[model samples]
Target: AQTVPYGIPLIKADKVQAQGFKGANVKVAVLDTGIQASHPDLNVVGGASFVAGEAYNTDGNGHGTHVAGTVAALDNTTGVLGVAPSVSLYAVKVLNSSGSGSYSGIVSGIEWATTNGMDVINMSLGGASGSTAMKQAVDNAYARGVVVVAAAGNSGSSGSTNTIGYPAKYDSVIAVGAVDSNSNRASFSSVGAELEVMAPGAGVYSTYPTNTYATLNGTSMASPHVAGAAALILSKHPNLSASQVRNRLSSTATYLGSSFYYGKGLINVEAAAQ
Candidate 1:
């Protein structure tokens, strides 16, 4: 079972670029199907494949690339753009081409990304169970001041009633649920006390495998929107500590109280950028 939040539109990269981020010099790490580094829409600076070091860090299942594209894909003439237009991307292929991997591999990738100086780590990929290894790595990164974001899970009905997926439920990590342009929580979005914020996650138009673009939905898709928004906030305040950044994000976010479904509130990049 999966809880799917509606996906947010690829942030207007041009507008964000106009803010002068261009995501330049910023390194956003993506842990998923890898990225198609050669894709014209994204900038893959460097990558490390934890999937036995054999799996290429490029789109295989397309999920990772989609999230990567949402965060930092190059804003060219074709294809959808990312939120951090100037930011560079680093792919840590933890999952295989099939979009599956062991928890040990995911933890390894997180450790590597944190040590490698990633400003942000996007885990659009997630599992039902939590791992002590993964939790430790995430907490370590949090201590080091790295921003970590992940999906709250798509277990929808099964995940409701106080159960949230791991890594997201882990304290200090930014847990995202999906909201639509209308600002309503997606029916499929997982809800609980663990939610930190909400963003667009339905009918998300973004880059896909095989040089394609399409609309997809899921909380997996919504997580990247917050990750990308955080990237934009980081671009303006590079020196801000991770705690401060997360705090500002959570505090500045528009609140939708008691709805529970929308978490803290719908994410507003306009406010976050300031």
Candidate 2:
């Protein structure tokens, strides 16, 4: 039975939705491998591909479809319920089938989302982009009223010094770390000053390719929770700017540990929407 994803209730998505906020009319661009638009449980509005020779709305890697499910999978008797059940999801394919893509493609994805009037841009994929073009695209998107949210990185588990990846490290984008079901910070989630918040990322159950479901783990899973929350907040107060949306979310989160670890804390969309 798909009552709701555990992560959704953990972040109080149920409480937010109970207040009549289904994230309807909110446009969210998910920058990742791609999405399985044919998935019965997803609410895909449309998409565009930056990756060459790849369809924008197909999920060959499974990561993008899982991320999209957490954001706005249809609230029906199917796989699992998403945080914002009715959000207009746009698949901006930056990564390819093998879950790899060029930095320039990522930049292009942000540009597409910005120009197309996306309210929220969720980058569940990450890498250290040495190019200034990445930051420039993110900054431009934010200034253009797009709320960008990205995964901090999975390098923490690998013992890499650069725990937080680029684009997420940028001030214009919200860097999201991961917390397990117990609200404990996952050791693999980058616990640094750059983190804007934490959410359920460990063993997250969501959609996958070919209309199936899977439980994956990573900060990649954590970022979309915040992006969905952003959509919920915007659905009610559609006039809020990107900065305002960030303030509303960051200001409302309750503490889970040191500010350095969980950023502001777990995002309280119920409070943020109020």
Candidate 3:
């Protein structure tokens, strides 16, 4: 009963897949609430937990699994498809069952992903304030060739301001904002300095825990879309550096609004690969 979600075509990932760019051999670290190891629609190779109370392979909050599904849900018939269907998802459990994590834990996950040779790190979590340690970790990961992407936070009004949160607000990370099917920036999508790109985040349909599906919204959902696109681009241009991959995404994005709100605009993965 599952079908392709609107986000697939909205970001042009559908065309990228048709061109045989399904993120083959790309390693993406889903550093968040963890992933459901039993999810039939995900290709989670392995994982480990930094949170004290949660297992890395289990997503008690259903947040990280949902985020992982958006990045690489299986290209199967019975469940919703992902942007990069062939991506290798790794559950780097930083957040606990309560869907929260200390900056120290998050930084450790970043170090882990960087050391483990992750091509991309999709962090669908962010907070109000940032620490020097978090920024250093993100910088180290990006410098070590990991394409770092994070949510631009959910604290925003229909009006604009510098609402971008930590980790995502860092210079080395790509701050992804949210858009709806109409290609309009979602009202809750944080905007301001360092905002880099947009993705379909409103009512995004992706995998949930318990072998089911859920529709969620936020820059959290939007971030995984960009993360998947980065993986697809890497599949095609494996030699490109992390910063080069960032340029590819921002340069090819479909412009939808003012730079103040949309940055480089909505992601176009098919064009980015070229």
The candidate maximizing TM-score is 3
Q: How does each model score on TM-score?
A: 0.91, 0.96, 0.98
Per model, state how many residue pairs clash. Answer: 21, 0, 0
Error of 2 at 8 (Å): 0.8
Model 2: number of backbone collisions: 0
lDDT by residue (1-274, candidate 2, tens digit) is 5646789988888898888898998999999999999988886888899998889988889999999999998887778988899899999999999999888899899999998999999999877653789989999999988999999987664432446888899999999999888888888887567888888999899999897899999999999999999999998898888999999989999799777778899888888888
lDDT of candidates 1 onward, in order: 0.76, 0.89, 0.92
Q: Supply candidate 3's per-residue lDDT for 252.
A: 91
All models, RMSD in angstroms? 4.3, 1.6, 1.1
Compared to the true structure, candidate 3 yields what TM-score? 0.98
Q: Under the 3 Å rule for N, CA and C atoms, how many clashes does model 1 have? A: 21
Regions more than 4 Å wrong, model 2:
157-162
What lDDT, from 0 to 1, does candidate 3 have? 0.92
